[PDB]
Amino acid sequence: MKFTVEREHLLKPLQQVSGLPILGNLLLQVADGTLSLTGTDLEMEMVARVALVQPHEPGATTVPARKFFDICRGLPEGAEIAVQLEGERMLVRSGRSRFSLSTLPAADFPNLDDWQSEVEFTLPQATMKRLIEATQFSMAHQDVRYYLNGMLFETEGEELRTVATDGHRLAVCSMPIGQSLPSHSVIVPRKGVIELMRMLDGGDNPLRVQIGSNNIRAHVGDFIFTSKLVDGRFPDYRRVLPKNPDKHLEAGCDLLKQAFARAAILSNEKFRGVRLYVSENQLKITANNPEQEEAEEILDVTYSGAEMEIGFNVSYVLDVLNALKCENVRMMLTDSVSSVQIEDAASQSAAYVVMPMR
């Protein structure tokens, strides 16, 4: 196995694939004028393909991922990196820098089982980025309800939808992708969502997604990501949307966020409770803690509806406001023991639902 490639063509691919001892290695394969790099944890797999425009020789091996990445990253801008297999070592040469890395056999590298694609669609990279970033923060953190630790990906009509929830708060985001899709839902584990997000470079290259009965695959440029799915019965976001909200509040997002952030300082450190008092064109936020300390914020808002008092975990509210990168926010309420819906005043593409504290 031999190849010689410029550093700039190796870096990004190594980065992408690098994020049983053999699981700490990358599989390198030279075949048909292409270098393939694969990384896996048994649950998911990233593969990059690199065209070889210089002389090269076929073969495969496996080398330490971090060490190989760190060597290439440490080399200077515009370096050429020559690689060849010698005995049980992989030699790397650039300029007058030389390295000999340990290897494990390519035949020992684990392969995910083959599976069949049941649903396929394409979408812009920016649509996937929007879908994930809109909801990722609402996924559970190591909940014993495993399905809550991942992200629901749902197809309905011509829309792709993400849903994330931890049993207390929920995020949902739907985007049109211009293709007739089957009605279908799968749960992607948290590590899969992180990787799916990482492979979005920020360019013209559109995403091709393939879903099987137990797997999902995403193709972007010269990268292929594959993950297992999660089994379990994911919550239905439709249940938890305020059915016919009679109370509507509109306020500046940043103003609201800064007031919640200040009030949070004097909230219970563990329970994070704040109280909202809504009245005509006014919101008051209060917080107090076991040390008897007290915060009060009063803000001008646009509010029609009856006066009411409602409690929330201020962290959940702040998370939503930080996720809403916008000028004005709309909140839709029912009563003090029911969920609140929070949205961008200018877009209905994402919705956030937070259940109150008694």
Binding site: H168, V337, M355
Partner: peptide, 5 residues
């Protein structure tokens, strides 16, 4: 905190 429902 109430459970979301």
């Amino acid at each position: 905190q109430l459970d979301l429902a």
